[PDB]
Amino acid sequence: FSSESKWMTGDWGGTRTELLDKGYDFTLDYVGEVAGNLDDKTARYSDQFALGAHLDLQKILGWHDAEFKLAITERSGRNLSNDRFSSVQEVWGRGQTWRLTQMWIKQKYFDGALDVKFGRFGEGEDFNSNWPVSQWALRVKYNITPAFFVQVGAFEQTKGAIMPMEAVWSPKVNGLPGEYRLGYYYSTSKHGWWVVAQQQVTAHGGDVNRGLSLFANFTVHDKVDNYQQVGLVYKGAFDARPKDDIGFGVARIHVNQRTEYNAELYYGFHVTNWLTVRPNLQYIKSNALVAGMKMQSSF
C-alpha cells in the first residue's frame, strides 16, 4: 500500500512496470459507498470493482497503432429501510452484479488525427459528461486541433442503431483549462441532445492545479426527459490539504410530469494518489436529507 503511485498494490517488485513494457496494463479500480438519511430511516452501501485489461497491440501483436481493451465489473450492495394509524414496515435487501463492460479494439490512423473504436462498450464512454452497454458499437473520432475534436458513432439497441455526434472543445481561457461539449443523437424515433461547459476560473496564485471551477451540464432524451446540473468546485482551498476539493451542485431532473431537485455538498480528501475519500451531504426533493461517503482506490 504505497503512497504516491496510482497503485495501491505497488509495482509488484517491478513485474508490473515490466508488464507495461511488454505492453500489458492491468487495473483494478474500487468504488465503495455508504449513505443513510437523517417517519422513515434508510441505509445503503455498495462495493464496486472494475477489473480491466488494456493491451498495447503494436508492442504485442505487430498491429501498428492498435489497442485492445477488456473490462469486467462486479458490484454488490445491501440496503435497508424502516417505515413508521400505526404501521411498521422494515425492508432488507442484498444484491450482486457481474457484467462485461468493455471489449474493444481501437486504432489511430492518420498519425493521430483519426481514431476508430470498435467493439462492445456504451455511449457513456465517449459522449457527454447499471447504465447501458451495446453488443456492437463503433466510434470515429477526428482530432482537428489538439484542443478540439468531432466524433460520431453507432450503438446497439437489430432494427436500429443510436447515432451520436459531438463536438468537444478544450480551450485555454486565460491560460486556465476549460471544456465544452455540444452533442446530438438519434435512433433509426428516439433522439436528443446535450451541452456541457466546465471552466477553471481561478488559479490559486499561481498553482494552476488549485482554484475555482464551475460547470453546467444539460441533457435531453425524447422517445421527453431533461437533466440539468450546475455546480462549482474549489480544489485545494487551505494550503495544508492542497489536493483536496470542496464541491457544491444543484440538479434538476424532469420526466414529462415528475420533477426532482438534488443539491449536494461534498469534501474530497486526497489521501494519496491511489486513495480518495469523499464524505458528502445531500438534500433531495420532489423530500429527504442524505449523509454519505464514497471512496475510490485503484489497486
- Residue bearing cell 508488464: 19
Q: Which three cell numbers stand for residue 132?
A: 447501458
Answer left, alpha or beta for residue 147, where phi above 0 means left and psi between -120 and 50 means alpha: alpha
The C-alpha angle with vertex 115 and arms to 110 and 118, in degrees rounded to 5, equals 135
Q: Which three cell numbers stand for residue 285?
A: 426533493
Whole-number Cα distances in Å, 141 to 12, 31, 119, 164: 35, 29, 15, 12
Spatial contact of 156 and 134, defined as CB atoms under 8 Å apart: yes
Whole-number Cα distances in Å, 84 to 16, 38, 88, 289: 54, 14, 5, 17
DSSP for residue 210: S
Spatial contact of 35 and 80, defined as CB atoms under 8 Å apart: no
- 107 half-sphere exposure, CB direction, 13 A CA radius: 10
The C-alpha angle with vertex 134 and arms to 133 and 139, in degrees rounded to 5, equals 110
Q: Which residues on neighbouring strands pair with residue 275, listed in sequence order? A: 272, 297
Q: Round to whole Å and give the CA distance between 258 and 255.
A: 5
Helix (H, G, I), strand (E, B) or coil at 12: helix
Which residues neighbour 36 within 8 Å (Cβ) at sequence distance 6 or greater?
42, 43, 44, 290, 291, 292
Q: Round to whole Å and give the CA distance between 90 and 183.
A: 44
Q: Which three cell numbers stand for residue 60?
A: 504485442
Residue 14 phi/psi, 5-degree rounding, is 100, 5
Alpha helices in the chain (DSSP H): 17-21, 57-61
Answer left, alpha or beta for residue 8, where phi above 0 means left and psi between -120 and 50 means alpha: alpha
Closest-CA residue to 150 (of 170, 121, 134, 135):
170
Spatial contact of 18 and 280, defined as CB atoms under 8 Å apart: no
Computed on alpha carbons and rounded to an integer, the radius of gyration of the chain in Å comes to 22
Spatial contact of 278 and 21, defined as CB atoms under 8 Å apart: no
Handedness of CA 56, 58, 60, 63 (dihedral sign): positive
Alpha helices in 42-152 (DSSP H): 57-61
Amino acid, res. 151: Q
- Write the CATH number of the domain with boundaries 1-299: 2.40.160.180
Burial of 193 (0-12, 13-18, 19+ CB in 10 A): middle
Resolution in A: 3.1
**Number of helical (H) and strand (E) elements in the chain, helices listed first:** 2, 19
Q: How was this structure obtained? A: X-ray
Q: Round to whole Å and give the CA distance between 229 and 217.
A: 5
Closest-CA residue to 137 (of 186, 167, 104, 115):
104
Whole-number Cα distances in Å, 91 to 35, 130, 139, 273: 16, 22, 43, 38
Q: Round to whole Å and give the CA distance between 53 and 34.
A: 28
Q: Round to whole Å and give the CA distance between 140 and 110.
A: 12
Helix (H, G, I), strand (E, B) or coil at 273: coil
Q: Which three cell numbers stand for residue 69?
A: 481493451
Q: Which three cell numbers stand for residue 210?
A: 488549485
Q: Round to whole Å and give the CA distance between 75 and 95.
A: 8
- Residue bearing cell 456504451: 122
Q: Round to whole Å and give the CA distance between 203 and 175.
A: 9
Which residues neighbour 89 within 8 Å (Cβ) at sequence distance 6 or greater?
82, 83
Spatial contact of 134 and 122, defined as CB atoms under 8 Å apart: yes
